[PDB]
Amino acid sequence: STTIEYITQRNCNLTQIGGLIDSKGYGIGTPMGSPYRDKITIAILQLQEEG
């Protein structure tokens, strides 16, 4: 959705219809047993909460 959104918003000749027929997540990949991923998740939550 965001790719087509960017494409349409950066031109004046493309129509965007529909925004969700499925759902996939995009986050920060971390190695196995990452101890520092917890604070990463906390900061992500804080940014989402504050908008």
Binding site: G25, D38, T41, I42, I44, L45, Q46, E49
Partner: peptide, 17 residues
């Protein structure tokens, strides 16, 4: 899922958004 509740208890991947 909130970071306040994240610190107390870690959630799983959100099955619905």
């Amino acid at each position: 899922i909130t970071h306040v509740r994240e610190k107390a208890i870690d959630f799983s991947k959100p099955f619905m958004t």
